[PDB]
Amino acid sequence: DTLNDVIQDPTRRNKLINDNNLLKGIIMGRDGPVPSSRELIVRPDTLRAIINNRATIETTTMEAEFTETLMESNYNSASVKVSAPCITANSEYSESSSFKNTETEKSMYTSSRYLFPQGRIDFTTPDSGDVIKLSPQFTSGVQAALAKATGTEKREALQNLFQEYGCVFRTKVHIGGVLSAHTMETFSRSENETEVKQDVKAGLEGAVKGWGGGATAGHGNTQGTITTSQNRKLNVKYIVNGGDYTKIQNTEEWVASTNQSEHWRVIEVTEVTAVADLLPQPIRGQVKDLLKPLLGKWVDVEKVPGLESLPVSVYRPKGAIPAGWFWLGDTADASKALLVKPTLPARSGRNPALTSLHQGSGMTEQPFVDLPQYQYLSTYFGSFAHDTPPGSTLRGLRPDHVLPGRYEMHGDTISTAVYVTRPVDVPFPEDEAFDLKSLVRVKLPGSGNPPKPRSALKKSMVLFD
Ligand SMILES: [Cl-]
Ligand SMILES: [Cl-]
Ligand SMILES: [Cl-]
Ligand SMILES: [Cl-]
Ligand SMILES: [Cl-]
Ligand SMILES: [Cl-]
């Protein structure tokens, strides 16, 4: 009946907590977001709730790759944001993804959800408050991991802990029923981004409005095609959550079932908190430091010879590179270069932080990532070979490690012109990036060259001292 009653009655409420896995952390993987089999927090006898019967249509637009299953799970932008690094790191990479970001093309996900809510449930973060308590078993696993003797053993234990419990926990969820449509769009960079985003959003919102309004043929989960006002053909995935699915073929009956508590499910993930952030200091900081996939070391550099025609000097770390450490590309930094070292051992099924590189088969001397979808920061000034220094110690990066950078172009002629990559200079960045002055050649000879880097390394991924 009413949501307020549910929270009161322990049996109605526990069915709500259990059927929706509200105590479970979320595991990100190749198939998407999966509830842990273990409970992460202590079960409360009552839930913080905010009543809302107001049906609305919301729309989320997303340019971040690897987030499609989260979009289909009705995560909002903020929830996708927090969850992005985890799912990116745990995704199954491939060279043949329909999602494509190139020099000419750009892709994005758009999801529209017709909500039929009953309210929103919030789990208070430690800053009370109603405050949640981490499970004794979980906080035990943490203590045990931190009690290990060597760094690797500590980190390896933390990974198992998080692989088991999950990387994020849903701290705010809406419940009820939902009819949602999800699509991906790939478009030329020569198009107006605003126009494409509004055009897709309008077409997708119109589709779900007709669905939940009862003006279109009723239907459950299925795939289809819609056409925008600008004649864009979109492949759409329709998803239903909550309510009685046996009644979905008749939309209005479906909507009526939304008022039945037995059929309420999560219809939107509104806020997500990284599990580690549920920890009190200084345990929180110890874990997060250990979780960092790379160690960092600033070393001196040396100018590269053969680059007198170039508008700037090119620098590489001064040999010899300490064994087990790697560099990330030619820089214009004459003072220091960053070396990195992976903190986690390579294991089958695990996406390593770094990838080695190999020279292209075509008419190019530029490196290509061995591992699909991995990224590097600089063009290679010279001829790359994986078996010869310094290319032998050069490494690419797992996609979660990088953000888009920005070019500062130098040169009086294109053929010698270079881009110097800086962190993006938006005033309030969510993820802070290293300034590495990664060097990118403006025009490369000749086609067969890999896509041009414009990336910056996240500081949150590198552990110092
Ligand atoms: Cl899914
Ligand atoms: Cl709570
Ligand atoms: Cl469901
Ligand atoms: Cl190749
Ligand atoms: Cl690249
Ligand atoms: Cl840019």
Numbering used by the authors: 53 to 181, 184 to 519
What does the publication say?
To gain further insight into the structural conversions in pore formation, we chose pleurotolysin (Ply), a MACPF protein consisting of two components, PlyA and PlyB, from Pleurotus ostreatus. Previous studies have shown that PlyA binds membranes and is required to recruit the pore-forming MACPF protein PlyB to the membrane surface. PlyA and PlyB together form relatively small and regular pores in liposomes. The membrane attack complex/perforin-like family (MACPF) proteins form the largest superfamily of pore-forming proteins identified to date.
To probe the mechanism of pore assembly, we engineered a series of disulphide bonds to limit movement in either TMH1 or TMH2. As performed for perfringolysin O and other CDCs, the TMH regions were trapped by introducing cross-links to the central sheet or other adjacent regions in the monomer structure. This trapping allows oligomer assembly but prevents the TMH region from unfolding enough to insert into the membrane. The disulphide trap mutants were engineered on a background PlyB variant that lacks the wild type cysteine (C487A) in order to avoid incorrect disulphide bond formation. Oxidised TMH1 variant PlyBF138C,H221C (TMH1 lock) possessed no detectable lytic activity, but reduction of the disulphide restored wild type lytic activity. The crystal structure of the TMH1 trapped variant was determined and is otherwise indistinguishable from the wild type.
